[PDB]
Amino acid sequence: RYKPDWESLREHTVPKWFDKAKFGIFIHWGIYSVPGWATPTGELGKVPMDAWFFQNPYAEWYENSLRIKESPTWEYHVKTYGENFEYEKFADLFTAEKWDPQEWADLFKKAGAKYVIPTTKHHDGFCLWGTKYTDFNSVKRGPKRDLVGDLAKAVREAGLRFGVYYSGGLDWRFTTEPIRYPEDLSYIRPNTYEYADYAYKQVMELVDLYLPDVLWNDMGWPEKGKEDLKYLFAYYYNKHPEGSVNDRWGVPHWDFKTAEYHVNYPGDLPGYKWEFTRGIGLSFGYNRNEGPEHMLSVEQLVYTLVDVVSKGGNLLLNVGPKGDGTIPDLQKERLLGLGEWLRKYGDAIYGTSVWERCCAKTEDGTEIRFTRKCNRIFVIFLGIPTGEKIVIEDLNLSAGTVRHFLTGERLSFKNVGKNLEITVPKKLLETDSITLVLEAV
Amino acid sequence: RYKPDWESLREHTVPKWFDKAKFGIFIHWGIYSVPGWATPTGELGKVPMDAWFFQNPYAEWYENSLRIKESPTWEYHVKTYGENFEYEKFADLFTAEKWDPQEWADLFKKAGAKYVIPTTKHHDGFCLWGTKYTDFNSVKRGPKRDLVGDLAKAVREAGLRFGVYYSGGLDWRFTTEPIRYPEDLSYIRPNTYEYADYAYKQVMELVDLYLPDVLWNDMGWPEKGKEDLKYLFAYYYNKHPEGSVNDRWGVPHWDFKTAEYHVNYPGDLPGYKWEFTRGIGLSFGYNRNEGPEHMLSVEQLVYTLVDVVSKGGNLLLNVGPKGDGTIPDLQKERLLGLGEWLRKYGDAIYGTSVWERCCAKTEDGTEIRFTRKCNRIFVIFLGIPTGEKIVIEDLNLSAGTVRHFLTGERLSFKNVGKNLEITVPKKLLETDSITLVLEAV
Amino acid sequence: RYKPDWESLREHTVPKWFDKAKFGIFIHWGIYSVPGWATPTGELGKVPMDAWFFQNPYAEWYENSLRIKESPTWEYHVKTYGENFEYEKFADLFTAEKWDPQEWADLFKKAGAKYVIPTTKHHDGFCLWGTKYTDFNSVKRGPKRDLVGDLAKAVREAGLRFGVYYSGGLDWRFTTEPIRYPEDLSYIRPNTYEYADYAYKQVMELVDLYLPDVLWNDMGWPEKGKEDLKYLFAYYYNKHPEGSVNDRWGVPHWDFKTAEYHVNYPGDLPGYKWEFTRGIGLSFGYNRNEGPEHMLSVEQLVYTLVDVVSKGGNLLLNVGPKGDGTIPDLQKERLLGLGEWLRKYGDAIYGTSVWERCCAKTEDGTEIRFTRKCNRIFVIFLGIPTGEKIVIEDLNLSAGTVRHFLTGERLSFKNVGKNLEITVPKKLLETDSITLVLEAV
Amino acid sequence: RYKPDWESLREHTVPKWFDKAKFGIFIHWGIYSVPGWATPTGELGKVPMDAWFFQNPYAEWYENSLRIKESPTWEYHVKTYGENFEYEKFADLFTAEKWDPQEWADLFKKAGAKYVIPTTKHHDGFCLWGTKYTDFNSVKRGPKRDLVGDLAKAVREAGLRFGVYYSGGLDWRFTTEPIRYPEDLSYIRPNTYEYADYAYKQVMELVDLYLPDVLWNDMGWPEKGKEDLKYLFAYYYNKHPEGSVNDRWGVPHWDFKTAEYHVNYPGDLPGYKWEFTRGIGLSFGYNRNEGPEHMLSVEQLVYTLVDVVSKGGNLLLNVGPKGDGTIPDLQKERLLGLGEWLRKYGDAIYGTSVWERCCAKTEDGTEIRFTRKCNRIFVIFLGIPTGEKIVIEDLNLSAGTVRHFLTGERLSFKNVGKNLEITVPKKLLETDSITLVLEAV
């Protein structure tokens, strides 16, 4: 099997299904979904961190914001719900009246996602499964139902892989002071041995009850429980070798790394498996304030996915559900948009590998991304060029045959100097959707 | 802010209010106050430690003594309350029927104390605030009241600073064997991780509920929780920079050091801020056995305070209240005595700093202590000399002007050799109270 | 006293009573005794460990076996009790209806045991004393009685020493996955800080409530609680210097080492005090499947005891009681057999010490073991030789006088070369029981 | 770039060149090559370790064996060199008079090897480069030449990759006692801070002087120096990203695992990149006592390489040169035979990947091994079947087209039941060399 030690765990690497998958759905759903409110300030990495917690665009961070008197959230809360209204009271209002996990799994499958990962416990400590280590869970409060297990059955029934998100680094049920500055994160944590046991038992429980395909931890792991992971990871891998874990544990082992909005985004091939995550908007949890102005457009999403895939990554796109379990129309439509694109071009995404390079551009300034499948080379343009004459800068090919992807039509090309020229018959160009895609063999 | 690490915490030093304060009241009040009984054996540091726990003069140590069969306390307990009478039963008898925190704060202010610090939890583990981590507290038992919070409101309303005493190193609710020898202290402790979390959460709770001006720990901090202090101290300092902590945590940081009775008392300037603590008698908790024979006399107290202050310290004089919340007459009168002296001579104590030297004496053997305030030098005699001719040994002055403190009267002096001679007109001498005080400018 | 540190604890060594004792009774009694079933596969150390947990001969391991679907135990359980029948349900069926601790102590004393040690808590976590740290104990469930305390009173009343067995390394009340391979033991453990506190408090409790003569730990001590032993061992030794601990804590200190079936058995003098343990059969807990085919025969037992004693050890023979508290006839008879032998030859066992060598044999192949008592040398044959002429190989004696043990009869001997010859008059030989024993002076 | 900590080093994985190389040459050459002597007892993993160090088949362990008095090596030394001839004296005999690195590089290339790894310093502590950290090296002694350096130029000129072997775990220049049993290894080591520094500094120096392609450490890394490896690996990877390190350091990071003779040899696909190492005979260092009986045949070597390769490993075949720098005829001839088979079947070995499974066998028991290149599946028979009808037990194929690798000839086949049947005309079977190779698309 695997032995509880880093040298040994190192023998386990990102499983094939995950590398081949390329696209997954993240779900931040919780009692924060009820107030479903945040100031849509901007993207993490571009909003200054001395103001970020005070005008937090992450709506799942509502309680932390609510603990900061006079901050937009405090303002909003008191005026909408009042002061005699504690954050926890939202667990009772959290009723998932319209929820149907099969509908969700159908939606994510249609969107082309090959795996799904919900928040089983977010920073506020509310648990979406009937854990036996707390009564602040979806079985005893609000939904009166094992959201995690029920969704796992649906997803798996649809043929998708199922993972779990857990906030091991933060649990506000163990702290009183909110996070006001990034520096606060170094001391405002549970900090106790009790919390380390708790996190450990809760993840062991998720493993025993649902044997997830991915262990997606967040905000690091309690310093006192770090050595525990040697055991937990061995326990997990020995019951499920195709399982996997991310890089937010702060220990030697991890199967694939992560990046959030701008934070840790690679500009070129990074050299290890990784995964990109972001919201359809600026929040993970639902934000009734966000208008389309804040969300990506189907095209941006397709471009986001290609840039990610060309660099060896998986896109973990987040969906932010309403307290009643429905998925906001704006998010549903973009998901489908993406699903439509993937239905046409999926063969140049799923099962692919990185090429010698990820990137290129045309004389005219259109960005190009590359992907490979044995001897095939997908050339994906982030847009559809206007003219039939395309000039790719700094690129030569020895392939000899270059087809227009969707139609299969052999095309004319030649390496003119340090560039590459191809003529893409407008009949064909007009045929593509959001991306001109060519296959070089 | 401050970062959770020793290098960083080092940036925080004893706040000015504390250095300027010079005098505070300690309060050891608890269910031990009910039996209010101890053998007044002698002072810590002069009674031999192979007999000390067997005839403990610290009445707040009643339960530890009671656990030693056949020891004066066992003897006394069985004959007064009987064997079917567990120590814990005192939490029910602890009713504070006559307690009025405003009266206390009035008394301490009149006594000239600038800060007050009660035991929130002593070695027996009984808590004087409605902590949420145990039901063995004053809110659920006996007083049916938040003694800590109510006293903090009173003290602060009187304009005094408020601190907290916590027995982090010992809690007998987690041990069964009593301490019989000083060696027992190295292994007879809670010792568990559970206790370390407990202590941590309880002090965090005191910080969140009352934001004390001083964190006065006792008997060291649980070895498993030591690293926790980096976080707790940063958390505390970041919510309250003028706060402070003592030196009984056993970690790198501390704001001022401590000394108890003879233990760690400095003979001369120590070179860091420190604080002296002792009972009006030989016990901290009330001891109905102590007669005036065991207590200091107003004069001794005044001398104690001057010796302390001259050496850069603060005197933390303990008051040992009765189970019914009243302050025993013997202690009240001495407190007032001291208050009277401070009303006359306070200007040569509060706000002062140490001088080149702390000490001197006269040809006749009267001890002299020094204190400074910019260009002024207070010369405080521990007594009032008989003759108008005073000879101070081994002292010269370049000041040129030396006034009799209370009256302001310029006096005649000259440096005769290696000594200093001053003539203090008996009109003036007769005017002083417990101390002849001169001001040199 | 003893200080909580290894250097200091080292000052404590195996007490005299224990070295002089030579024989003790082990008792594995628990709710596992109810199903009282195991496949009698063979001896630990000879059955291959890749099959051992799947056909475990240790019946007290029933629950671990029951957690392995389709294993003889699963098979058996479902067919006898059914699937809707959890292992814990056995705590209710565990009623000790026929139990009489005085009868037990009488039996063990008659068997010649000088000390007794029951399992207070085995791997399944069920406790046989009214611990205050769990309700899964004999006081709240099944027997409705403090088995540990009641047995300690009986044993001590019979004049025997009393010890305690505790499963510190394993507690299945904190794990879900069974042990399938020896490798699983390195990660399938409680692993939490909570468990370390628990084990610590439970052993401290056994010490405070019964002050055992031996602390017999099993399966190592929780890694997070190892440093705790410095304190626990000092606490124990300071209340009971004649107490003792075994070697299954995984820390620097231990008073005597252990060996189980073939595991760690010494072939010759080891050089430190140790103790041998095994079942009358192949299991510790009762196994209604075992027939005499699986048990040792009185003679084998006597030989087992002599081989152990000659090598400086104590034999800790286990008795496996029924759920109703009675001792199975097969075990009772062997115990008595042994008791009978010890009544005749005890003087060449109790109070003895090892000699220059432990072993020898005759020209004919009869094994011989040696033991000492000052100037006396017991020569114990594992059998009774046929002829009056005995030839011991590779042995000479300078003693001059060699008596036939039981009768006292001086015998004729001489050192012929590298061997030793003695003539044992058949009158005498016919007089011995399972062993020819000679005394050389 | 890479940072100095396990988590970041995790990002580095086995370089593509290494994974594709499949075959390398190990060279154990040292002053131990002069005596060039050993008892050819057997293969590691097959010889009992209670005898192993006493009849050591690893001629490079000569000094260790010489230290064990009365051992075949000791007897042999005294008669050949004399009792007054210290092992270190061999450094003066080690002259490499007939050495020609280009000649070696060539032989290795003609042999089919893609990288070479020489012992820069084996257990005896003598270094084959002008290290500045010791005078016991080839520059100041014996050859008065930088063997490591000159060999690196030559191997690289031949266009092969160059790695280094280093004995971090052992250095007999720091010990006096010999290794007698595996156990001895737990304490007979340098053990000093000094040695940990020596080792770090020397590998650093190897990295600076030669930037090797592989850092192949042996016998673990000194405990006191383990943390230095985070720094050394980061430094190394930052200077040479495509470099690699083995698994014998005893720390979390490694790019590929190792197996030695029987020790750690995978029965099937292991899940990680590894490499098999062994001598052509039973020794790494040259052994004049080995005749062909002790060596592999060209066929066995081929089978070896195929089996290793089909399981995702590399074969690191050892060559043991003579003190004069020549390669023994027996060894050279085996290398060349392997080179010829690879010249012929290289395509089914180099740059391949594992397939669904590594193994299969014919109805009549010929072992079959698999490899792949994109859609091409190579089918390697360890030997050439006598008849034209071949039956592969338990293998069905979907490919529709199965050619004869050497010729390209399309062959007739059909999945019959759970086996696969194929007709290979004898004209082709008569053309293969040691293996019948089929190609399935």
Ligand SMILES: C[C@@H]1N[C@H](CNC(=O)CCc2c[nH]c3ccccc23)[C@@H](O)[C@H](O)[C@@H]1O
């Ligand atoms: C997927 C998202 N992960 C967030 C945690 N993010 C990180 O640790 C990424 C880097 C980062 C540094 N400081 C931060 C403050 C807030 C959010 C992210 C970060 C969570 O705070 C958020 O609720 C959501 O679950």
Ligand SMILES: C[C@@H]1N[C@H](CNC(=O)CCc2c[nH]c3ccccc23)[C@@H](O)[C@H](O)[C@@H]1O
């Ligand atoms: C202010 C007083 N502090 C005491 C603890 N004192 C100390 O740690 C000072 C030094 C000392 C060493 N061994 C001791 C035993 C008993 C009391 C004091 C000490 C407490 O035991 C006592 O109840 C009271 O709260």
Ligand SMILES: C[C@@H]1N[C@H](CNC(=O)CCc2c[nH]c3ccccc23)[C@@H](O)[C@H](O)[C@@H]1O
């Ligand atoms: C006296 C017996 N001790 C056993 C634990 N034994 C040991 O740790 C000895 C060595 C050993 C190694 N692996 C094992 C697996 C099962 C039992 C023993 C061992 C227990 O498992 C058993 O229930 C019984 O209490």
Ligand SMILES: C[C@@H]1N[C@H](CNC(=O)CCc2c[nH]c3ccccc23)[C@@H](O)[C@H](O)[C@@H]1O
């Ligand atoms: C390539 C070879 N590596 C050997 C070290 N091998 C190992 O550490 C793994 C196999 C092994 C385990 N215990 C051993 C004891 C002696 C030799 C080998 C081993 C070296 O001892 C040998 O000189 C040669 O360099």
